[PDB]
Amino acid sequence: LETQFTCPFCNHEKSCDVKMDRARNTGVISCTVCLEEFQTPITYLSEPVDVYSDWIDACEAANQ
Amino acid sequence: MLGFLSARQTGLEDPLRLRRAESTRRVLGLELNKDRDVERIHGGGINTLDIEPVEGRYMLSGGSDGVIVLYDLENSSRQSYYTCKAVCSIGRDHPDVHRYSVETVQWYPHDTGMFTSSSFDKTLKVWDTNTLQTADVFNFEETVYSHHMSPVSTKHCLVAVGTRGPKVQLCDLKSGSCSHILQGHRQEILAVSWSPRYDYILATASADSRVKLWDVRRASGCLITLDQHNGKKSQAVESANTAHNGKVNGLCFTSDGLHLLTVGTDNRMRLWNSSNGENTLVNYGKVCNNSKKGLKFTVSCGCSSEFVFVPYGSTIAVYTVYSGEQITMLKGHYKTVDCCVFQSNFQELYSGSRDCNILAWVPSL
Amino acid sequence: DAEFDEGFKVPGFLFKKLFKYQQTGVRWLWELHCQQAGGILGDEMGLGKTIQIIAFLAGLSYSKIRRFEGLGPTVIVCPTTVMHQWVKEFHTWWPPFRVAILHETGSYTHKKEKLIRDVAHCHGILITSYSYIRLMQDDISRYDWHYVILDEGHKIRNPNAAVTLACKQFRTPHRIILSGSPMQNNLRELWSLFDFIFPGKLGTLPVFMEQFSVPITMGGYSNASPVQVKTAYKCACVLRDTINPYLLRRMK
Amino acid sequence: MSYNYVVTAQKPTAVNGCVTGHFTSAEDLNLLIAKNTRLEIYVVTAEGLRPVKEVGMYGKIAVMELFRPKGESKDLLFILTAKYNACILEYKQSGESIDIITRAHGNVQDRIGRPSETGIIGIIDPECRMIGLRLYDGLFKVIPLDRDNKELKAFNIRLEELHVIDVKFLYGCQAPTICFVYQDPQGRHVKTYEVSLREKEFNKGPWKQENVEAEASMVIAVPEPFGGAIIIGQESITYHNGDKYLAIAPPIIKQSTIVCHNRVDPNGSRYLLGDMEGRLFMLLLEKEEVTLKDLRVELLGETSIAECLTYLDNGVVFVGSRLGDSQLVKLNVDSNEQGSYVVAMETFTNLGPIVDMCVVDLERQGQGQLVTCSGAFKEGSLRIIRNGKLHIRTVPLYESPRKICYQEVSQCFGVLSSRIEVQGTTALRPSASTQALSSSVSSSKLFSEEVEVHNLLIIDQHTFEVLHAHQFLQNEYALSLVSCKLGKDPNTYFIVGTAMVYPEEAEPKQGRIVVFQYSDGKLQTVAEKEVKGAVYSMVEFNGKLLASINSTVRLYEWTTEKELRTECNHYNNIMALYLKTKGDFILVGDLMRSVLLLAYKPMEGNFEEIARDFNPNWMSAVEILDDDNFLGAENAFNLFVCQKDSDEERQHLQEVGLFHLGEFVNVFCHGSLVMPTQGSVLFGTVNGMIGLVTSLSESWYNLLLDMQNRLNKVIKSVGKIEHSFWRSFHTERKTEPATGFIDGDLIESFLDISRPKMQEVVANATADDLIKVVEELTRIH
DNA sequence: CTAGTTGATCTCATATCAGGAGAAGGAGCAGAGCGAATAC
């Protein structure tokens, strides 16, 4: 499972970094290029793929 | 100021004096707008703005969500408080909407019936403003970081496009020829800007820390390469003669086109003699930027002293171009400011930032 | 005398000999010189291209236009059979030029490199063969030539031939090709020629292939679908508009 | 679309340039005077000036210089127009016929560029190898003359110094050498370059840059025996030749800055210098056996406030003035027992800056009469103008007039005036405010180098003597004046809008509207009203007082208690500088939003923005022609007529007429100077022109338009300037052709052509019909 | 000297799971130790 992801907003490969703040149960995914940021709740079973998942889902939901 | 009016009436001073002095005074009194608002439609940060060059009424805005909004800036209502309503919108439901962020939008010069928009979806679309349909599309092998049409060309209608490829593309809007390219850069071309003075002069700034001026008619590469030191640290040209100590992510010719303002990721802005690329050594202090893409900043027009409005973190830093003296920080944005566009008719400013807001700065009183 | 836009004068006696299309070609060549761009005199065989080049160079040296005052040291690359032809035409049309041949036949009778040095430092015309340009590319490109006219420049059609890579080492912008047939087998040849005269217009060879060669060629086959024919038409029109300013092709 | 007819009732009179030389003949000493559009050629006789020609340029003459190329019998005249039409003209006299042939012409306007602050500068190399123009910052345009052009092809040389104050060509230099003073953040420095036409670029000057006075504002190229240059500043006069550095600081030039100069001798042993206060000095170069020994300045005397001056001969100096009457003065060898060697021989009338003017039917005739606030500080005056030719009286006030209004009931003019006091304060000269029959000073309870003292002068409208002079509060500027009766009481009042001016601020925050009544030869302060800004303009609006405080157009009612009470306000303005009225409608001229058609809806009691023009025109004046036509003057010397169109788009005023007048219109007023055309709007300008605007009918306008095109095809302009270009609406960010305006001067020139040229004009009715039409058009002025 | 013939050589162009063991790196934690920094 890759940790760096293509940004849904600027389509820059591996430009998204994921930070797991487990102490606060929050994952923050940020694109280095276009500076888009997204915050989602996470669990101890969560992974950066799950945070990027929640980001893609939030984008598609907001774009309806 | 009553002295200014009296001198204008009595012919002591040319009306030019009052006009430019009052323009400068208005720019100095720039503040968060007391009675003005801009309609919010972008779901993401605004990466670019462009007020049309003729009549200065309509404004384009490209968002990080790929939509393009067309606003009317005129206060067609009778109140002193108004919102710049959105006339048109390439929204998510448009058949030709950009799939990724729109990074540059530009009105066609000489006519408001057409505009262009380049996106990180590797497309430069040319839109008919009336029907609001794509008149043309140019596809690129790599994402577009910036594009620019010449604000002066009555003869040519080339769009200079800077992508992550090391080549500057020149797309002919006359019969569609995107094959022309300029060689000489080595990394992503983060900014491109045509000279407002010379028809065929194009300045290109790339991540290789170099800024090159090209005569696109010419067959022999770039005309000038900008050098910080002008020759103090001189070396055979393979890696020396850098404009900045980082990525040069913004270009802006001054109003007369005799100088060039380059902002780079070394936290420095520099002013260059546009005729021989010599550094004028104007200081400007430290200009904070860390943008990984092109940085859009503009200069004032029709004032006694020229100003440059540079995005500076979540603020707009206003500098005097030829002295470097820091005028002020326009402080009203909540995230990093991506673009600022200057309305020269009324010395107004419109800034788009990552907080999904377009803020209008108007002179006070 | 004939006076062109900025400072270019071609002598009246020389101008009078030229035909209408030939002096139109001289006009076009000097517009290219103003643009500092190359070109292809695509006029068919026999229409007169040696004379147009000779007249344009004569007017360029005569006009004293502003490194080089007037005409610098130029190199003319032509097939071996027509070198002395170029010498004869230069002598009859503009005798003031010094016109030396860089070839075994030649006229020098010393080290060739001395001849290239002499022509470079004397602002003369060095006529050479394509084989010599390939062989003497080390010496031929160290002297900052002003004009690199290639007669029958379709020999540069193969982008990977050693002669092509040699001829594409000249630093000057003023690159001219004389060839009444600057396309012989496919559009790769056109790309090679236009890379020589103006490296940028048609992009990198992969890009030119993908954008022009496959569409234009594939729409000419007998089994072409109508949509594909229209796509080939669009690409051909785009290419014609792209190459119009730098190709001057008059028919008989 | 609108139909308007503009005609010059009085040609411009302010001189913006004067040059002497041998233009008409090799032996004649010509005086060429540039009034704004008019070039007047006189021959300098033993006495006075003999006018030999007067041509009307299609352009505002910004540069006018005479130069004699090698082999030329007599001088050629280089003229540059404000719209950047350059022309080299030659005088060719064929017996009775006089022709100003255009030897060369062209347009040198750069498409983009910041026009320089100090204005267009034009210089010619003393050996006439080139013309150097400073039109834009950072550039120096060069027109070579050795290369004999008929199109005046020019090339720009980039000038590394971006704020150039003045520039001249030095004398006695093998190469064309420019010496110029420029401003950088380090100070003002004088630098030199040697221009190369072959390499088309500057080269290192004969002598390096030298740091000069902070206000060093003038460069004078000294002739060959001395060489070098003289730099005049506010406090000192320095002379540089590269190693000679002479300097003086005469205390007598400190009081006022020197603004003009002229070379008396061919060798530059003497120069004239005029200051803004009118003082004329002689700067003498003492030679030593040649080099330069020492500089002296001696006050010759006092003249009109000289824009320019020229020594003709025999001690005669033409002092050309923009702010007052031009003068022809004599420089006596010995003083006049008052310390002055200057004696005025002749005075040429100049309607100075016509800041304000009122049309009055004085003497109870059917004839109008213009009373104009003309001139400035020392040359300020009232001018009374009638049709008799135009007869012009003059009432010297010796202080700047600002506004004027006629009170018919009181048989007097109320005139706002301003004088300069130096120190508490002391007047520099006895002015009309101080020479009133009776006087008073405002004692207001509302508020508690050199300064301007503002006064309200009550002037008898028979003898034009100052019946009264009411001085205003300290540091109070009177801006507006209106004579009207408010509310329902019968008394007629002088209502004066004022502003409190202090150096600590850029826009007045305080002001008051003062209501005076003039009765029994006294000016009693009937009422006051403290307002929170400068009252730029006031007008009577249906018995109420419509005032414009800084950005707010508000309406006051005159109550039974004889006080002003606000009724309504409108705030959607940057600064409402100009107010006009017709019925319930108001026309608000804004500083830069350019018009606003407001309406006072009486059934409710507030204003309503009926319409607006959203083009950014900077205004100088505004007027209402018809119920739906609105004339306005932009600061770029343009007239434009807006029309209420026919949704929210109805709020857009449409600019239905555009025209480039070439004059800075200061005031409009309904009226006519005479006893087919609808309406009559006179206007007064800065250069002294009085013009007249009338509305035409559609078919007649079309016919006239046709005549204008025909005349443009027939009549040949002096500089080969196309009339459409000259009258094209022009602004630094816009350029359009003239529409909705007929140039009355061009139509009236139809009389001054011979019959074959008329037949050429009228190829497609007969010529006599059009002669009748143009005669009727001339009747209105 | 001096041109014409003879071979070699180069370019260019013609299409279509039931390993294991050890050594080197990097990671995260743990503490020790010393500079500054409040503060009694």
Ligand SMILES: Nc1ncnc2c1ncn2[C@@H]1O[C@H](COP(=O)(O)OP(=O)(O)O)[C@@H](O)[C@H]1O
């Ligand atoms: N203007 C002219 N006047 C006389 N002869 C000409 C003229 N132009 C061309 N020619 C002749 O026509 C022939 C063909 O011209 P040339 O340029 O050698 O061939 P191509 O143009 O096909 O390369 C030459 O022999 C030349 O002498």
Ligand code: BEF
């Ligand atoms: F006849 Be060929 F084109 F030289």
Ligand SMILES: [Zn+2]
């Ligand atoms: Zn991104």
